[PDB]
Chains A and B, each alone.
Chain A
């Protein structure tokens, strides 16, 4: 078939997908903070 790209499903998927990776990145960085 001739499927589209930007769809409603896509939006959702990114609202959770995008932030997540951004956090996993943030957290991964914390593993090195100290005192």
Chain B
């Protein structure tokens, strides 16, 4: 049916731009690979998982995702039951077979096109309505999902709240922030130091609350598109084609990819330092904690200690007056964390609490996190580039963040590429300048 007199081999999948049916097998077969992975990897992680040892010290990145939703863990991120892990893993792994079946089926047996084998499923790219509608269906499926989380947290068990009053623990959220003024406030937050935008979310109420809003707002738009067609501008503005639509979704993922990179790198809440590693700033903070703690025991008055530059070996002031840790760590004075907060006063680190309220669990927390900063090599040798071999470790936060910046990036190229193609395809010149009517040749010389 389709061969070189369609597209070139290495652009093969573009030969499916107009075979709805087969183009469905792909998406159903692909969606299989993701479940397969998710499932197959979880079991791989669990197969190697050692209960009495930090998750971040085991190259885990899925078990910690489950742990956050309050599963198999308890006080301080202590692993209680590995069953929920095994479950989530096998279930996915199975569903991968189910989906994979459909994919293979729709791509090599079933109808090569859909429009005729059922007009409901068959579709037309330029069919502004079918499009607005299918989009509408998916906008609801995703919306239900957003609530599927709100449920697990409020009814089915909770989530891992590291800020837990009694100290990190699985907690049931029964008071989601629904106040729009606050929820949407986040979107109006600067993305720079301090005000961190979305990534500044720091308590589960907002997380849960906000997801409540998204679920509804999302399904609402799902119905709205089901029941409509793009207006006028919406039409005189966009390009309506198979590629153009792709592109738009490409640029969309890219952006979400960058936002994700920063979330796992900066956020403490939805990414508990207990399962992942300590954050970049969190670790630099802990070094200051550790040594202010040490030397203070040797009889040093941290409050008045003067360092080489005359700035304050242990404590100094930020640009707006607050008391922070000194040293290069002055750049991370925006770090907040369960272990360190009880030392903060209304003006920042309180010299009295630091002087006699430091608790042992904090001293060892600071020590732990200090010696587990997110520094490591490709071959997984934890530490600074000049370090010695021995401690095989690279923070999950480093792995996640890099992988996703690469993907996020290439996708932005993907966007540019597929969008550039769509605009030339539409107007129609994505295959060359018309030897005959060469546009440039009809334009006045600027010379």
Q: Do chains A and B touch in the complex (CB under 8 A)?
A: no
